[PDB]
Design a protein around this motif. Structure first.
Motif, PDB file in Angstrom:
ATOM      1  N   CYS A 133     -28.854 -28.356 -18.628  1.00 46.82           N
ATOM      2  CA  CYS A 133     -28.756 -27.792 -19.880  1.00 46.82           C
ATOM      3  C   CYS A 133     -27.649 -26.629 -19.687  1.00 46.82           C
ATOM      4  CB  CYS A 133     -30.063 -27.157 -20.600  1.00 46.82           C
ATOM      5  SG  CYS A 133     -31.248 -28.660 -20.834  1.00 46.82           S
ATOM      6  N   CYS A 134     -27.767 -25.756 -18.793  1.00 45.37           N
ATOM      7  CA  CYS A 134     -27.073 -24.855 -18.414  1.00 45.37           C
ATOM      8  C   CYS A 134     -25.503 -25.223 -18.082  1.00 45.37           C
ATOM      9  CB  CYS A 134     -27.405 -24.152 -17.094  1.00 45.37           C
ATOM     10  SG  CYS A 134     -26.622 -22.358 -16.759  1.00 45.37           S
ATOM     11  N   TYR A 135     -25.189 -26.307 -17.494  1.00 41.54           N
ATOM     12  CA  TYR A 135     -24.011 -27.206 -17.278  1.00 41.54           C
ATOM     13  C   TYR A 135     -23.423 -27.330 -18.557  1.00 41.54           C
ATOM     14  CZ  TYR A 135     -24.271 -27.756 -12.160  1.00 41.54           C
ATOM     15  OH  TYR A 135     -24.276 -27.622 -10.755  1.00 41.54           O
ATOM     16  N   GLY A 136     -24.418 -27.835 -19.596  1.00 38.77           N
ATOM     17  CA  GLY A 136     -23.862 -28.423 -20.772  1.00 38.77           C
ATOM     18  C   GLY A 136     -23.199 -27.006 -21.855  1.00 38.77           C
ATOM     19  N   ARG A 137     -23.448 -25.967 -21.096  1.00 37.27           N
ATOM     20  CA  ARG A 137     -23.058 -24.948 -21.934  1.00 37.27           C
ATOM     21  C   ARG A 137     -21.752 -24.077 -21.360  1.00 37.27           C
ATOM     22  NH1 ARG A 137     -28.765 -23.573 -21.910  1.00 37.27           N
ATOM     23  NH2 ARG A 137     -28.469 -22.043 -20.158  1.00 37.27           N
ATOM     24  N   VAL A 138     -21.279 -24.544 -20.210  1.00 36.62           N
ATOM     25  CA  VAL A 138     -20.246 -23.876 -19.586  1.00 36.62           C
ATOM     26  C   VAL A 138     -19.002 -24.354 -20.277  1.00 36.62           C
ATOM     27  CG1 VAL A 138     -21.408 -23.897 -17.256  1.00 36.62           C
ATOM     28  CG2 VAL A 138     -19.295 -25.411 -17.748  1.00 36.62           C
ATOM     29  N   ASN A 139     -17.858 -23.977 -20.207  1.00 41.03           N
ATOM     30  CA  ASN A 139     -16.727 -24.581 -20.956  1.00 41.03           C
ATOM     31  C   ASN A 139     -15.729 -25.566 -20.679  1.00 41.03           C
ATOM     32  OD1 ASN A 139     -17.726 -24.200 -23.568  1.00 41.03           O
ATOM     33  ND2 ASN A 139     -15.285 -24.192 -24.000  1.00 41.03           N
ATOM     34  N   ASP A 140     -14.670 -25.181 -19.873  1.00 40.82           N
ATOM     35  CA  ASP A 140     -13.757 -26.459 -19.833  1.00 40.82           C
ATOM     36  C   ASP A 140     -13.516 -26.944 -18.261  1.00 40.82           C
ATOM     37  OD1 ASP A 140     -13.484 -26.142 -22.485  1.00 40.82           O
ATOM     38  OD2 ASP A 140     -11.694 -24.860 -22.493  1.00 40.82           O
ATOM     39  N   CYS A 141     -14.425 -26.842 -17.584  1.00 38.91           N
ATOM     40  CA  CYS A 141     -14.357 -27.361 -16.087  1.00 38.91           C
ATOM     41  C   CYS A 141     -15.686 -28.539 -15.827  1.00 38.91           C
ATOM     42  CB  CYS A 141     -14.322 -26.374 -15.080  1.00 38.91           C
ATOM     43  SG  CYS A 141     -15.660 -25.249 -14.890  1.00 38.91           S
ATOM     44  N   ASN A 142     -15.319 -29.227 -15.008  1.00 37.75           N
ATOM     45  CA  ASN A 142     -16.291 -30.325 -14.501  1.00 37.75           C
ATOM     46  C   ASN A 142     -17.200 -29.215 -13.288  1.00 37.75           C
ATOM     47  OD1 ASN A 142     -17.674 -32.254 -13.193  1.00 37.75           O
ATOM     48  ND2 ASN A 142     -15.935 -33.538 -13.295  1.00 37.75           N
ATOM     49  N   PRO A 143     -18.432 -29.032 -13.511  1.00 42.65           N
ATOM     50  CA  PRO A 143     -19.340 -28.639 -12.591  1.00 42.65           C
ATOM     51  C   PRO A 143     -19.552 -29.069 -11.362  1.00 42.65           C
ATOM     52  CG  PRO A 143     -20.314 -28.536 -14.915  1.00 42.65           C
ATOM     53  CD  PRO A 143     -19.140 -29.580 -14.908  1.00 42.65           C
ATOM     54  N   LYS A 144     -19.390 -30.645 -11.429  1.00 38.30           N
ATOM     55  CA  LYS A 144     -19.721 -31.201 -10.091  1.00 38.30           C
ATOM     56  C   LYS A 144     -18.478 -30.756  -9.060  1.00 38.30           C
ATOM     57  CE  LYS A 144     -19.816 -35.545  -7.707  1.00 38.30           C
ATOM     58  NZ  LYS A 144     -19.845 -36.899  -7.987  1.00 38.30           N
ATOM     59  N   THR A 145     -17.456 -30.906  -9.484  1.00 34.14           N
ATOM     60  CA  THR A 145     -16.355 -30.203  -8.766  1.00 34.14           C
ATOM     61  C   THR A 145     -15.570 -28.894  -8.879  1.00 34.14           C
ATOM     62  OG1 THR A 145     -14.993 -31.404 -10.500  1.00 34.14           O
ATOM     63  CG2 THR A 145     -15.691 -32.779  -8.670  1.00 34.14           C
ATOM     64  N   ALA A 146     -16.019 -27.947  -9.740  1.00 28.39           N
ATOM     65  CA  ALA A 146     -15.630 -26.661  -9.809  1.00 28.39           C
ATOM     66  C   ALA A 146     -15.946 -25.941  -8.633  1.00 28.39           C
ATOM     67  CB  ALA A 146     -16.208 -26.022 -10.998  1.00 28.39           C
ATOM     68  N   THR A 147     -15.063 -25.620  -7.844  1.00 26.17           N
ATOM     69  CA  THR A 147     -15.294 -24.760  -6.397  1.00 26.17           C
ATOM     70  C   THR A 147     -15.136 -23.171  -6.807  1.00 26.17           C
ATOM     71  OG1 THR A 147     -14.694 -26.666  -5.261  1.00 26.17           O
ATOM     72  CG2 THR A 147     -14.820 -24.457  -4.014  1.00 26.17           C
ATOM     73  N   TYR A 148     -16.206 -22.427  -7.118  1.00 30.72           N
ATOM     74  CA  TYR A 148     -16.497 -21.323  -7.318  1.00 30.72           C
ATOM     75  C   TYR A 148     -16.530 -20.506  -6.136  1.00 30.72           C
ATOM     76  CZ  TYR A 148     -21.243 -22.710  -6.973  1.00 30.72           C
ATOM     77  OH  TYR A 148     -22.435 -23.215  -6.650  1.00 30.72           O
ATOM     78  N   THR A 149     -16.549 -19.223  -6.349  1.00 36.70           N
ATOM     79  CA  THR A 149     -16.751 -17.918  -5.334  1.00 36.70           C
ATOM     80  C   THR A 149     -18.082 -17.463  -5.507  1.00 36.70           C
ATOM     81  OG1 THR A 149     -14.070 -17.471  -5.110  1.00 36.70           O
ATOM     82  CG2 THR A 149     -15.825 -15.720  -4.625  1.00 36.70           C
ATOM     83  N   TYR A 150     -18.590 -17.416  -4.324  1.00 37.27           N
ATOM     84  CA  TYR A 150     -20.004 -16.546  -4.107  1.00 37.27           C
ATOM     85  C   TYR A 150     -20.473 -16.095  -2.971  1.00 37.27           C
ATOM     86  CZ  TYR A 150     -22.025 -20.343  -1.536  1.00 37.27           C
ATOM     87  OH  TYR A 150     -21.965 -21.399  -0.734  1.00 37.27           O
ATOM     88  N   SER A 151     -21.313 -15.028  -2.983  1.00 39.53           N
ATOM     89  CA  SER A 151     -21.715 -14.607  -1.650  1.00 39.53           C
ATOM     90  C   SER A 151     -23.084 -14.277  -1.480  1.00 39.53           C
ATOM     91  CB  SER A 151     -20.779 -13.421  -1.328  1.00 39.53           C
ATOM     92  OG  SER A 151     -21.045 -12.401  -2.353  1.00 39.53           O
ATOM     93  N   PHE A 152     -23.951 -13.968  -0.410  1.00 39.89           N
ATOM     94  CA  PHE A 152     -25.287 -13.845  -0.263  1.00 39.89           C
ATOM     95  C   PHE A 152     -25.208 -12.354  -0.084  1.00 39.89           C
ATOM     96  CE2 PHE A 152     -25.164 -18.244   1.008  1.00 39.89           C
ATOM     97  CZ  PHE A 152     -26.236 -18.668  -0.052  1.00 39.89           C
ATOM     98  N   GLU A 153     -25.667 -11.318  -0.578  1.00 45.27           N
ATOM     99  CA  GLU A 153     -25.568 -10.065  -0.591  1.00 45.27           C
ATOM    100  C   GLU A 153     -27.134  -9.748  -0.337  1.00 45.27           C
ATOM    101  OE1 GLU A 153     -23.335  -8.016  -3.509  1.00 45.27           O
ATOM    102  OE2 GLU A 153     -21.702  -9.359  -2.614  1.00 45.27           O
TER     103      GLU A 153
END
Lengths: 122, 122
Positions: free
Chosen positions: A49-69
């Motif tokens: 449902c969350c993925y359904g609300r993001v906007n113009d990218c394909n969540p499966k292949t969208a490569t984002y930036t994150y880190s464990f703090e």
């Protein structure tokens, strides 16, 4: 992308996603219909449902930036779509960690025959 | 939804998706980065690009209308999003059937460690 989500899942549950979540219940990994079998499957349904609300990218292949703090998952994108996908994954990974205690191997490899019931609504 | 795509895959390849495609290579099922390992994985990558072009629905959970007319897959939706998702699945299922001959069990259960290479572009 799902491999990054898999990295988050590993940290929160200690489980390798391709051997577990990727084929769990009616919604985790490969699925999309039927009723969420338990709390774990409900995390996955809410994430869809969350993925359904993001906007113009394909969540499966969208490569984002994150880190464990420390242990916390921190999304670092400025880009709205990458950031939104990262936030969905973060939330879903925490949900899976919270419910790993009731993870049932019996829901592994569920297919269309187990997921016939009417789908859940967002 | 992926279970419906799984029905199409079954008809075209004779394989149950949750035991095969759902965890194959860098793009089929659970994945989203790295290089497509072979022709089968390339079908999945192209399908993700296809999903990237449908419009306002979540392809994983969008439940569309389709039928097998003889062996052919026929999408029946009028709704633009459901129809577009069904067309992506149909095309991907034919692609998987075409390449089942080179399906390599060695690509099953690939994880982030096997899919490090720079991602493919649509």
């Amino acid at each position: 992308n799902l491999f990054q989500f898999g990295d988050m899942i590993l940290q929160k549950t200690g489980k390798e996603a391709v051997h577990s979540y990727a084929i769990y219940g009616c919604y985790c990994g490969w699925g999309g219909q039927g009723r969420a079998q338990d709390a774990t499957d409900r995390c996955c349904f809410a994430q869809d449902c969350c993925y359904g609300r993001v906007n113009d990218c394909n969540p499966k292949t969208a490569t984002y930036t994150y880190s464990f703090e420390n242990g916390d998952i921190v999304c670092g994108d400025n880009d709205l779509c990458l950031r939104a996908v990262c936030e969905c994954d973060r939330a879903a990974a925490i949900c899976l960690g919270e419910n790993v205690n009731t993870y049932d191997k019996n829901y592994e490899y569920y297919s269309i025959s187990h997921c016939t019931e009417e789908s859940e609504q967002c």
